[PDB]
Write a protein that holds these residues in place. Structure first.
Motif, PDB file in Angstrom:
ATOM      1  N   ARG A 347       8.450  49.859  14.194  1.00 20.82           N
ATOM      2  CA  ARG A 347       9.267  51.017  13.850  1.00 20.82           C
ATOM      3  C   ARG A 347      10.006  50.790  12.540  1.00 20.82           C
ATOM      4  NH1 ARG A 347      13.000  53.881  18.353  1.00 20.82           N
ATOM      5  NH2 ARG A 347      10.997  53.406  19.366  1.00 20.82           N
ATOM      6  N   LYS A 348      10.462  49.555  12.282  1.00 21.32           N
ATOM      7  CA  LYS A 348      11.144  49.193  11.039  1.00 21.32           C
ATOM      8  C   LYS A 348      10.169  49.267   9.867  1.00 21.32           C
ATOM      9  CE  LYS A 348      14.642  46.388  13.306  1.00 21.32           C
ATOM     10  NZ  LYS A 348      15.798  46.986  12.571  1.00 21.32           N
ATOM     11  N   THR A 349       8.930  48.782  10.083  1.00 23.45           N
ATOM     12  CA  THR A 349       7.862  48.862   9.086  1.00 23.45           C
ATOM     13  C   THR A 349       7.564  50.343   8.764  1.00 23.45           C
ATOM     14  OG1 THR A 349       6.782  46.844  10.004  1.00 23.45           O
ATOM     15  CG2 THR A 349       5.458  48.272   8.570  1.00 23.45           C
ATOM     16  N   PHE A 350       7.445  51.191   9.808  1.00 24.36           N
ATOM     17  CA  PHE A 350       7.165  52.628   9.730  1.00 24.36           C
ATOM     18  C   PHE A 350       8.196  53.296   8.819  1.00 24.36           C
ATOM     19  CE2 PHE A 350       7.612  56.778  12.447  1.00 24.36           C
ATOM     20  CZ  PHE A 350       6.633  57.458  11.748  1.00 24.36           C
ATOM     21  N   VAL A 351       9.481  53.036   9.087  1.00 20.99           N
ATOM     22  CA  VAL A 351      10.587  53.580   8.328  1.00 20.99           C
ATOM     23  C   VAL A 351      10.531  53.098   6.877  1.00 20.99           C
ATOM     24  CG1 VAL A 351      13.140  53.589   8.192  1.00 20.99           C
ATOM     25  CG2 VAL A 351      11.987  54.057  10.382  1.00 20.99           C
ATOM     26  N   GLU A 352      10.323  51.792   6.646  1.00 21.84           N
ATOM     27  CA  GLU A 352      10.212  51.285   5.278  1.00 21.84           C
ATOM     28  C   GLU A 352       9.012  51.867   4.489  1.00 21.84           C
ATOM     29  OE1 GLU A 352      10.638  47.062   4.714  1.00 21.84           O
ATOM     30  OE2 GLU A 352      11.162  47.342   2.589  1.00 21.84           O
ATOM     31  N   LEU A 353       7.883  52.122   5.148  1.00 18.61           N
ATOM     32  CA  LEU A 353       6.696  52.686   4.493  1.00 18.61           C
ATOM     33  C   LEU A 353       6.943  54.138   4.037  1.00 18.61           C
ATOM     34  CD1 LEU A 353       3.943  51.187   6.805  1.00 18.61           C
ATOM     35  CD2 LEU A 353       4.149  50.721   4.357  1.00 18.61           C
ATOM     36  N   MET A 354       7.721  54.887   4.808  1.00 20.73           N
ATOM     37  CA  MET A 354       8.082  56.246   4.446  1.00 20.73           C
ATOM     38  C   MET A 354       9.211  56.271   3.398  1.00 20.73           C
ATOM     39  SD  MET A 354       8.059  58.290   8.017  1.00 20.73           S
ATOM     40  CE  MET A 354       8.884  56.937   8.907  1.00 20.73           C
ATOM     41  N   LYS A 355      10.236  55.440   3.591  1.00 16.71           N
ATOM     42  CA  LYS A 355      11.427  55.422   2.748  1.00 16.71           C
ATOM     43  C   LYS A 355      11.270  54.690   1.409  1.00 16.71           C
ATOM     44  CE  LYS A 355      16.357  55.327   3.005  1.00 16.71           C
ATOM     45  NZ  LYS A 355      16.240  56.758   2.582  1.00 16.71           N
ATOM     46  N   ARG A 356      10.778  53.459   1.442  1.00 15.97           N
ATOM     47  CA  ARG A 356      10.582  52.697   0.227  1.00 15.97           C
ATOM     48  C   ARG A 356       9.167  52.937  -0.306  1.00 15.97           C
ATOM     49  NH1 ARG A 356      13.938  48.757  -1.083  1.00 15.97           N
ATOM     50  NH2 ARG A 356      14.279  48.092   1.088  1.00 15.97           N
ATOM     51  N   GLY A 357       8.166  52.839   0.564  1.00 14.98           N
ATOM     52  CA  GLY A 357       6.774  53.032   0.170  1.00 14.98           C
ATOM     53  C   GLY A 357       6.385  54.430  -0.279  1.00 14.98           C
ATOM     54  N   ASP A 358       7.150  55.453   0.169  1.00 18.18           N
ATOM     55  CA  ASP A 358       6.972  56.878  -0.147  1.00 18.18           C
ATOM     56  C   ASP A 358       5.606  57.411   0.346  1.00 18.18           C
ATOM     57  OD1 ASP A 358       8.103  59.364  -1.258  1.00 18.18           O
ATOM     58  OD2 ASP A 358       6.712  59.089  -2.976  1.00 18.18           O
ATOM     59  N   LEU A 359       5.159  56.923   1.515  1.00 13.76           N
ATOM     60  CA  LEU A 359       3.898  57.365   2.083  1.00 13.76           C
ATOM     61  C   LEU A 359       4.154  58.535   3.037  1.00 13.76           C
ATOM     62  CD1 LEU A 359       2.138  53.930   3.012  1.00 13.76           C
ATOM     63  CD2 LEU A 359       2.158  55.149   0.790  1.00 13.76           C
ATOM     64  N   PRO A 360       3.142  59.402   3.247  1.00 11.66           N
ATOM     65  CA  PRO A 360       3.315  60.483   4.226  1.00 11.66           C
ATOM     66  C   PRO A 360       3.488  59.892   5.626  1.00 11.66           C
ATOM     67  CG  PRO A 360       1.344  60.824   2.874  1.00 11.66           C
ATOM     68  CD  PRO A 360       1.791  59.410   2.662  1.00 11.66           C
ATOM     69  N   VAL A 361       4.266  60.562   6.499  1.00 10.06           N
ATOM     70  CA  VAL A 361       4.464  60.146   7.898  1.00 10.06           C
ATOM     71  C   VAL A 361       3.188  59.627   8.577  1.00 10.06           C
ATOM     72  CG1 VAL A 361       5.391  60.770  10.179  1.00 10.06           C
ATOM     73  CG2 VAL A 361       6.425  61.735   8.120  1.00 10.06           C
ATOM     74  N   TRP A 362       2.106  60.416   8.579  1.00 10.26           N
ATOM     75  CA  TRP A 362       0.857  60.012   9.218  1.00 10.26           C
ATOM     76  C   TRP A 362       0.308  58.718   8.666  1.00 10.26           C
ATOM     77  CZ3 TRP A 362      -4.119  58.998   7.706  1.00 10.26           C
ATOM     78  CH2 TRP A 362      -5.095  58.923   8.702  1.00 10.26           C
ATOM     79  N   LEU A 363       0.311  58.528   7.325  1.00 11.03           N
ATOM     80  CA  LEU A 363      -0.195  57.312   6.719  1.00 11.03           C
ATOM     81  C   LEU A 363       0.633  56.072   7.103  1.00 11.03           C
ATOM     82  CD1 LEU A 363      -2.569  56.168   5.088  1.00 11.03           C
ATOM     83  CD2 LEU A 363      -1.160  56.480   3.025  1.00 11.03           C
ATOM     84  N   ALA A 364       1.972  56.170   7.043  1.00  7.24           N
ATOM     85  CA  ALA A 364       2.893  55.103   7.435  1.00  7.24           C
ATOM     86  C   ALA A 364       2.705  54.723   8.915  1.00  7.24           C
ATOM     87  CB  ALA A 364       4.329  55.562   7.213  1.00  7.24           C
TER      88      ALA A 364
END
Ligand SMILES: O=C(O)[C@H]1CCC[C@H]1c1ccsc1
Length: 435
Positions: A347-364
């Motif tokens: 879940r922490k990885t998911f949040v970082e991928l959307m927030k820092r990584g700027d990936l779409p929800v589905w991709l993260a």
């Protein structure tokens, strides 16, 4: 409205005054009743307008778009819809707001749908009150609602490519026009055509919105070419809206990839919000709304509703409970509540991928649910050959964090990471280990 256990839909038509007249009255009464209040703005441009209308009132602005002095004793917070969902996701204490006011509560972005779900569940549970402000609540079938002044509606063939003949009506107009296109790439082509004909064009999209919107107030323009982003409170001093009535829709095919299907018809709410940009000044009747196709309920099966379920499944509410989507829009997705719940580390990885990584929800979610850590970009290169991303008709290439030149071929393919030049640029930086 302020009484607990009540969700009020402020369905006043476009330009009725739900921000300049209605919002300050609600804030005054909430402050008087000692109700802890959150005001949710769709964009930072709308949050700046709200500061002007709520000036003097004790409101804590949780946005850098506002430069005001905070006293420290404010019981009314103001933030964007995405900021609200983001804080619910992160390991941060969020107050238990007694009153929840969402402005432009029609916004279909994953974080807006998730905030409507979370808030409406609290209200259904008897824990809080809510006010959803929109001219087009979920379910609306009226593309031609009431307005401050009469509108001339015209069904006409609207161009979607550059043209040499057949559309004299587009350029033989003296006023200012807001033209809604289905995509950035489609807007670029029309804008080039208009510019070549001698017109001043400004282009707006989700990424360039705060910076470019200021040009609509700082310089003379003939046309504003925009995507669906201008449906969320964007105010223009225009006399014509040209609406292609078309949009791209992100769709999850086979559960393994996301494609951008269309262009296809916009919903009735989008058509009414786009038309709603004009007919707002009762001293200037006769604004024009030229529309180039019909409406259909294309929000069914749209990736944003599945993505909203991915966000809600990872937001704590009460022990094992999970917030439902707001009832009028809960059918736009076939999902099992909890099916996207991730364990603490994923879940922490998911949040970082959307927030820092700027990936779409589905991709993260694809990356985080696979056990991959945030900085590990091996997945950006080990996909199948049909997942090769193309740029200028040649496979897109990056230099990896290892100093090796590789072809961009992600394990999970989401069309949004390469929809335009700017999106692919940011994704190349991601695959390279640049953020
Ligand atoms: O902005 C949205 O609605 C989506 C698009 C991708 C990032 C995501 C998001 C942002 C705040 S909480 C989830």
């Amino acid at each position: 409205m302020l009484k607990k256990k009540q969700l009020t839909v402020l369905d006043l038509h476009p330009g009725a005054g739900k921000t300049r007249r209605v919002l300050p009255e609600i804030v005054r009464e909430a402050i008087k009743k000692r109700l802890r209040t959150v005001i949710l703005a769709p964009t930072r441009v709308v949050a700046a307008e709200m500061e002007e209308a709520l000036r003097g009132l004790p409101v804590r602005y949780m946005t850098t778009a506002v430069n005001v002095t905070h006293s420290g004793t404010e019981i009314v917070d103001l933030m964007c819809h995405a900021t609200f969902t983001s804080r619910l996701l992160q390991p941060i204490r969020v107050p238990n707001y007694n009153l929840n006011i969402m402005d432009e509560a029609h916004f279909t972005d994953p974080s807006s749908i998730a905030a409507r779900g979370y808030i409406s569940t609290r209200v259904e549970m008897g824990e809080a009150a809510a006010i959803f402000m929109t001219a087009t609540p979920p379910g609306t079938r009226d593309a031609f609602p009431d307005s401050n002044s009469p509108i001339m509606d015209t069904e006409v063939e609207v161009p979607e490519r550059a043209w040499s003949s057949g559309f004299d009506w587009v350029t033989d107009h003296s006023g200012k026009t807001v033209w809604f296109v289905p995509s950035v790439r489609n807007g670029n082509e029309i804008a080039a055509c208009l510019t070549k004909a001698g017109k001043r064009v400004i282009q707006l999209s989700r990424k360039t919105f705060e910076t470019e919107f200021q040009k609509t107030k700082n310089q003379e323009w003939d046309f504003v070419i925009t995507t669906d982003i201008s449906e969320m409170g964007a105010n223009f001093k225009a006399d014509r809206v040209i609406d292609s009535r078309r949009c791209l829709k992100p769709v999850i095919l086979d559960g393994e990839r996301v494609i951008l299907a269309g262009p296809m018809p916009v919903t009735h709410a989008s058509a009414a919000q786009r038309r709603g940009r004009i007919g707002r000044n009762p001293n200037k009747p006769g604004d024009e709304y030229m529309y180039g196709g019909g409406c259909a309920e294309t929000d069914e099966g749209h990736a944003h509703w599945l993505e909203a379920r991915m966000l809600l499944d990872n937001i704590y509410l009460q022990d094992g409970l999970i917030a439902s989507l707001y009832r009028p829009e809960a059918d736009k997705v076939a999902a099992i509540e909890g099916e996207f719940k991730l364990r603490t580390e994923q879940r922490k990885t998911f949040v970082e991928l959307m927030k820092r990584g700027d990936l779409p929800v589905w991709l993260a979610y694809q990356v985080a649910s696979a056990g991959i850590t945030y900085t590990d970009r091996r997945w950006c290169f080990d996909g199948t050959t049909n997942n090769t991303i193309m740029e200028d008709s040649v496979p897109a290439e990056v230099w990896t964090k290892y100093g090796e030149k590789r072809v961009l071929k992600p394990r999970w393919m989401d069309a949004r990471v390469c929809s335009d030049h700017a999106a692919l640029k940011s994704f190349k930086e991601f695959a390279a280990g640049k953020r």
